[PDB]
Design a protein around this motif. Structure first.
Motif, PDB file in Angstrom:
ATOM      1  N   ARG A 266       0.836  -1.188   0.000  1.00  9.27           N
ATOM      2  CA  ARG A 266       0.000   0.000   0.000  1.00  9.27           C
ATOM      3  C   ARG A 266       0.879   1.249   0.000  1.00  9.27           C
ATOM      4  NH1 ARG A 266      -4.797  -1.563   4.414  1.00  9.27           N
ATOM      5  NH2 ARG A 266      -5.382  -3.538   3.415  1.00  9.27           N
ATOM      6  N   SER A 267       0.315   2.412  -0.035  1.00  9.68           N
ATOM      7  CA  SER A 267       0.951   3.666   0.080  1.00  9.68           C
ATOM      8  C   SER A 267       1.674   3.823   1.392  1.00  9.68           C
ATOM      9  CB  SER A 267       0.063   4.806  -0.168  1.00  9.68           C
ATOM     10  OG  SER A 267      -0.937   4.871   0.741  1.00  9.68           O
ATOM     11  N   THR A 268       1.142   3.313   2.453  1.00 12.20           N
ATOM     12  CA  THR A 268       1.591   3.296   3.789  1.00 12.20           C
ATOM     13  C   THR A 268       2.469   2.122   4.141  1.00 12.20           C
ATOM     14  OG1 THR A 268      -0.368   2.399   4.648  1.00 12.20           O
ATOM     15  CG2 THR A 268      -0.213   4.735   4.585  1.00 12.20           C
ATOM     16  N   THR A 269       3.056   1.447   3.214  1.00 11.92           N
ATOM     17  CA  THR A 269       3.842   0.280   3.339  1.00 11.92           C
ATOM     18  C   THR A 269       4.913   0.448   4.380  1.00 11.92           C
ATOM     19  OG1 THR A 269       5.170  -1.413   2.298  1.00 11.92           O
ATOM     20  CG2 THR A 269       5.194   0.772   1.420  1.00 11.92           C
ATOM     21  N   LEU A 270       5.116  -0.463   5.271  1.00 13.87           N
ATOM     22  CA  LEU A 270       6.163  -0.556   6.209  1.00 13.87           C
ATOM     23  C   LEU A 270       7.451  -1.113   5.657  1.00 13.87           C
ATOM     24  CD1 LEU A 270       3.884   0.228   8.072  1.00 13.87           C
ATOM     25  CD2 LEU A 270       4.855  -1.120   9.751  1.00 13.87           C
TER      26      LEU A 270
END
Ligand SMILES: Nc1ncnc2c1ncn2[C@@H]1O[C@H](COP(=O)(O)OP(=O)(O)OP(=O)(O)O)[C@@H](O)[C@H]1O
Ligand SMILES: Nc1ncnc2c1ncn2[C@@H]1O[C@H](COP(=O)(O)OP(=O)(O)OP(=O)(O)O)[C@@H](O)[C@H]1O
Ligand SMILES: [Mg+2]
Ligand SMILES: [Mg+2]
Lengths: 198, 97, 246, 49, 233, 212, 84, 148, 49, 49
Positions: free
Chosen positions: A70-74
């Protein structure tokens, strides 16, 4: 606490390796018997495990597994080159019907080289090497080099399996479909793949 | 185009009204009620296609009036016939109001 | 010809049912009543009598139909009452033999909500005697007395030609049920029990079952031995030799 | 076949239980001379397999 | 050896395909909302189709791998399978197990469920791509498939004059519309299969037996009053 | 009994992996970040489940290590499941200088806040300026354009060290930053007063450092 | 939530209120009567769905019928009214 | 104080709906019709219009309720047709202000069944304008067209 | 969460599990006072570690 | 615990002769300080302090 089956799954000896591979972006096909079976068995819990990283675990309709950030990937992200996608689309085209009789599933670097050269537009080719390049030997050589390079990249992705010898001959896996076109009722795969290639 | 409309029928509500008025006497006198006899007498007042709905509604109204003490005896009730063409009912007599 | 049929379902001393018997239809039986009346309770009784395995039995609410195990409560304890409880089925085979199959249920005392279950079967009962009559004594009080398995065994053994069988393991119970044609497959092992329960509960809640969909070949295709045993026998000489060498 | 009809059928077919069904039995007539490797008593039956 | 094994595998596959095709016909023209038919699609995997053909006709090219007495038959099958499709990897599992997997015919088959929705052709049945009633109806269809298959399987272990009972449930049946319920009744009747359905009175099926329930408090205890009707129609 | 966490995993390890801090930390650790005392959350977490984490990561053929200064980091083995990489010599020059800066009591009055110019001035004060310039360009002879290029390379490498967790910039000013104890790993070749060759051999044997 | 926001909101604005419920047929008449009185006492709007018209004497109702038509699909909507 | 209310919901070029407008009720609005008629689709359009967050939106079947599935497909794409689509709400403010909120939806060409969303808002629209007409152009003999 | 739970109806597992977070509001006055104490307790943590 | 932290030594030492409250208990909560058993993550929950 933690769900019992999730603890069981990640306790398995195969997990570290598969984790490592997955995080790299590798696609797991039906070829990898044990890994594929493991994912089939523990999907319901592995999806939750990786959701904690803001990364999605997807099973493609063809059957292969892979991760989508996702955009928020860790997990730190990375992106492919234009040439990369070009090549990929090419390989998707080569996953054809006459392929079976033409090569029995085993291709060579030259097949892809020549297909690439023949099917692509000159301009985009130039864009791939350098815009100032012009139909020169050296240019072609560099293009070859890049081809090899990108091919290797792809092999890391699991798209293409090299036959175990130093020579550059390989076989195409089903996971190459990720490059492929959208399919509509009754549409011919050759035509739609070419339409995107154009 | 502009929206059209369609309307409901209140025949079943009217049916419930007649049945409840007809049945109120049993409670007021606390008279023992038997579903078999009541259904057999009451179905005679309507034609066959409507019998099923009448039976359903009558049962809905009757069960609100007291309980049947026989239910705790461990003895099942029989299937009583209530009309021709072969309709049946199962219920103990209502005693405790 | 002349497929068998389930004839009736009986509940004794369940929550809301002291003694009730339902006469099942040959094609369709419809349960009807307001919310909380007890419909799902009757189906719970049916399935628990059919598959008396406490590892599988889990009556989750219809809402949240597909979630995980979650709580440690299986939802069955609350449907019983203090004392002894029964659930029984009455069946007629193609042979027209009347067989009664059921289980005895009891709330295990403790902090937690646990249940004790024991299957049993009766054969040869006369057509004139109903289950509720077998399981209750008509004492002087307003309400009858439910009689435990000891009284029941004594009462049945007195009858002529009636046999009372009481099982120690679920496997035996399923074996007998299959031999009499009450179920379509003999539940060899716990895995078979799990698949059969999957079928029943998927039908109960409704919808395209995820588990059935995953393992479609495991459900729809029979396993064939012919292809294999030839090669196990031919392979035998090598297997023994290898083991001896090791 | 079920266990109940198994003894009946086994008695009925007797030694021929383990024969082969072949719908013509004239197509074997040329092949037959070659049969030097076979059980000492081979049974053949005609019908729709 | 070789060809004969291929023939027994082929005949087993053919018989399974035919039986499925027979089950498949009973489900034609079932109306559930916009769904109009259901199928079990059976196919043969390529990686095994080529293996079966090779074992049938190119045996002289691989006989070295089959008559070598240092390894057993199942091991020979596993090694031949790795010789074809070389990209396949093996998870450090014994070749014996892979061989026995190749010996099991079911592993050669690929199975799907398809529905004939609306104006469209045959589509794979996905829950998220259907309404509620269509999903319930499709579930019932697949369940009767399973029951028929299991009865065919076991009959070789049962008495010649025994026919097992068949019964299924449906909770919160109000979710289905009258047309769907008519379809479901037709199916079960044609299949001699009993049904028990629960609904909060919203549906009144004329055929069959009906039970009216009412829960009350009596002598400070919960009690259920029950009434029954049947025979209409 | 069966279906019990203890069958497959220690309770404390499962408890750690279920924590909300784990994914962040894991991600970071794998990327090579060092963890010091200032980022309390992380540090505390590490401390609480040290042995479980160590045991866990061991599966990968990697050591979760704790330096004496109290900072955690990852050291891969030769058989590592996770790739391993080495720092550039310019990174080392800036690293050893950052180390001397941390120790310097003369600048402790700054409360840890240093400026890129001060770092640069200290570096040129100690190392051979004109010989070090060779790494910037083979023809460098003290020209200002080349001096500015050196300063920009320093700015860049410093930015990389920041990502490794070795230095933290100020919230609003990027020309100033603060040090952390993780920098002491650059002194691993001299913390013991012994023969440099033997120390170096020991370090390469332990997998701490490679030659060039 | 509404209470919480009392300070930030302007004095003169009361926010809209609306909830859903699919497969309302799972509820019996008494339950729906309870639900309606609850929501109307709280000025709460509701949108509910059911195969059959479970609420004939309250609010508005729409009836949807889908028609296959020239190799595509079209939905026809008609209203319903309590009395006729 | 007079609380605000939702006046109506409008759908354009959805699966089965070309251009339809439902007028909501002050207390209760009911949708009826056989299985597959399109009730749940109307619910989904409303919610979509309310919370366009594509990360969130996940339309499971009513069966399988409460199961966190991570399904490959969120179920929204199939409810849309090719071309441009809309979903809008008309609201009367406590201030007696008419405000039109909504979204522009559009399928994404490509193998992945993705969707594009663009929110918008309209203020001060005259009370005589209906959204159904505002969002379409009358081309030909009563054969209107949708406009981007 | 709210909306979706209403749509599918029933006791939503996620809502009940975190009911504090959903119902109880946050207070800025609490915070302003707590700021000071926050600093102090952070410092103590430091030392402890 | 709020009573323990609020009321200090010099005045309330005469109050502290009750069996439930003492100073050391603030450090005893150091055990609880390290990790409470929180389950779902949003925003930032950390510890007893
Ligand atoms: N495990 C349990 N513990 C306590 N009470 C229970 C339990 N299971 C059911 N009940 C109660 O028993 C009564 C009957 O429940 P049941 O689920 O059988 O109702 P129902 O008639 O099927 O309802 P509906 O069709 O609306 O779901 C209800 O009051 C329910 O609250
Ligand atoms: N994502 C999708 N892709 C394809 N078709 C879909 C999709 N979602 C819904 N449909 C179809 O659209 C039609 C409307 O479905 P919908 O669930 O809205 O109907 P409904 O009237 O609410 O039905 P029910 O009450 O049974 O849930 C049905 O044919 C359904 O199969
Ligand atoms: Mg129920
Ligand atoms: Mg729907």
């Amino acid at each position: 606490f933690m769900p019992v089956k999730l603890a069981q799954a990640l306790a398995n000896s195969l997990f570290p390796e598969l984790d490592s591979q997955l995080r790299a972006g590798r696609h797991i096909g039906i070829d990898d018997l044990d890994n594929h079976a493991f994912l089939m068995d523990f999907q319901e819990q592995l999806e939750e495990f990786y959701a904690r990283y803001n990364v999605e675990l997807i099973r493609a309709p063809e059957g292969f597994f892979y991760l989508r950030p996702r955009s928020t990937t860790l997990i730190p992200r990375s992106v492919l080159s234009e040439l990369d996608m070009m090549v990929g689309k090419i390989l998707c085209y080569l996953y054809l019907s006459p392929e079976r009789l033409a090569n029995q599933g085993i291709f060579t670097s030259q097949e892809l080289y020549e297909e690439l050269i023949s099917l692509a537009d000159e301009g985009k080719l130039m864009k791939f090497v350098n815009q100032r390049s012009s139909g020169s030997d050296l240019d072609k050589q560099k293009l070859q080099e890049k081809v090899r390079t990108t091919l290797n990249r792809l092999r890391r992705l699991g798209m293409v399996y090299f036959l175990p010898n130093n020579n550059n001959k390989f076989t195409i896996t089903e996971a190459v479909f990720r490059f492929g076109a959208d399919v509509r009722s009754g549409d011919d795969p050759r035509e739609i793949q070419l339409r995107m290639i154009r | 185009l502009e929206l059209e409309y369609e309307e409901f029928s209140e025949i079943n509500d009217q049916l419930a009204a007649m049945i409840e008025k007809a049945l109120l006497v049993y409670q007021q006198e606390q008279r023992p009620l038997d579903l078999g006899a009541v259904l057999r007498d009451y179905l005679a007042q309507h034609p066959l296609p409507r019998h099923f709905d009448v039976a359903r509604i009558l049962v809905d109204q009757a069960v609100r009036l007291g309980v049947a003490e026989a239910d705790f005896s461990g003895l099942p009730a029989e299937w009583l016939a209530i009309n021709d063409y072969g309709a049946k009912v199962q219920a103990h007599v209502i005693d405790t109001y | 010809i002349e497929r068998g049929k389930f004839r009736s379902l009986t509940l004794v001393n369940w929550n809301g049912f002291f003694a009730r018997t339902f006469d099942l239809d040959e094609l369709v039986t419809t349960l009807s009543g307001g919310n909380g009346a007890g419909k799902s309770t009757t189906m719970a009784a049916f399935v628990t009598a059919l598959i008396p395995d406490l590892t599988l039995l889990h009556f989750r609410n219809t809402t949240e139909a597909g979630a995980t195990s979650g709580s440690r409560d299986k939802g069955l304890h609350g449907k019983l009452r203090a004392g002894v409880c029964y659930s029984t089925l009455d069946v007629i085979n193609s042979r027209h033999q009347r067989v009664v199959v059921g289980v005895r249920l009891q709330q295990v005392a403790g902090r937690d909500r646990k249940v004790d279950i024991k299957p049993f079967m009766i054969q040869g009962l006369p057509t004139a005697i109903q289950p509720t009559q077998l399981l209750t004594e008509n004492v002087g009080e307003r309400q009858a007395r439910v009689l435990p398995l000891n009284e029941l065994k004594d009462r049945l053994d007195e009858m002529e030609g009636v046999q009372f069988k009481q099982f120690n393991s679920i496997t035996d119970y399923h074996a007998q049920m299959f031999d009499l044609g009450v179920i379509p497959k003999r539940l060899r092992s716990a895995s078979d029990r799990s698949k059969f329960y999957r079928l029943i509960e998927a039908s109960l809640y409704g919808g395209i079952s995820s588990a059935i969909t995953r393992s479609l070949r495991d459900y729809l295709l029979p396993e064939n031995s012919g292809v294999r045993k030839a090669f196990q026998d031919m392979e035998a000489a090598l297997r023994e030799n290898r083991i001896t060498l090791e | 076949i079920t266990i109940d009809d198994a003894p009946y059928f086994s008695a009925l077919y007797g030694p021929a239980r383990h024969g082969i069904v072949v719908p013509d039995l004239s197509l074997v007539r040329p092949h037959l001379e070659t049969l030097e490797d076979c059980p000492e008593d081979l049974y053949l039956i005609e019908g729709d397999p | 050896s070789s060809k004969s094994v291929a023939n027994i595998i082929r005949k087993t596959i053919q018989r399974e395909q035919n039986r499925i095709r027979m089950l498949n016909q009973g489900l034609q023209a079932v109306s559930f909302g916009q769904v109009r038919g259901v199928r079990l699609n059976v196919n043969v995997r390529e990686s095994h189709a080529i293996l079966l053909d090779v074992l049938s006709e190119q045996q002289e090219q691989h006989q070295d791998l089959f008559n070598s007495q240092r390894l057993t038959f199942s091991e020979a099958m596993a090694k031949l399978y790795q010789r074809l499709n070389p990209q396949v990897d093996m998870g450090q599992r014994l070749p014996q197990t892979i061989g026995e997997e190749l010996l099991d015919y079911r592993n050669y088959l690929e199975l799907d469920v398809e529905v004939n929705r609306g104006s469209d052709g045959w589509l794979k049945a996905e829950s998220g791509a259907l309404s509620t009633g269509e999903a319930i109806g499709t579930g019932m269809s697949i369940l009767v498939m399973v029951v028929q298959s299991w009865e065919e399987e076991s009959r070789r272990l049962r008495g010649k004059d025994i026919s097992p009972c068949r019964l299924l449930f449906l909770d919160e049946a109000a979710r289905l519309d009258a047309k769907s319920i008519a379809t479901l009744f037709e199916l079960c009747e044609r299949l001699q299969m009993q049904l028990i359905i629960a609904a909060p009175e919203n549906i009144s099926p004329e055929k069959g037996t009906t039970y009216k329930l009412v829960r009350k408090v009596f002598k400070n205890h919960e009690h259920v009053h029950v009434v029954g009707l049947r025979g209409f129609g």
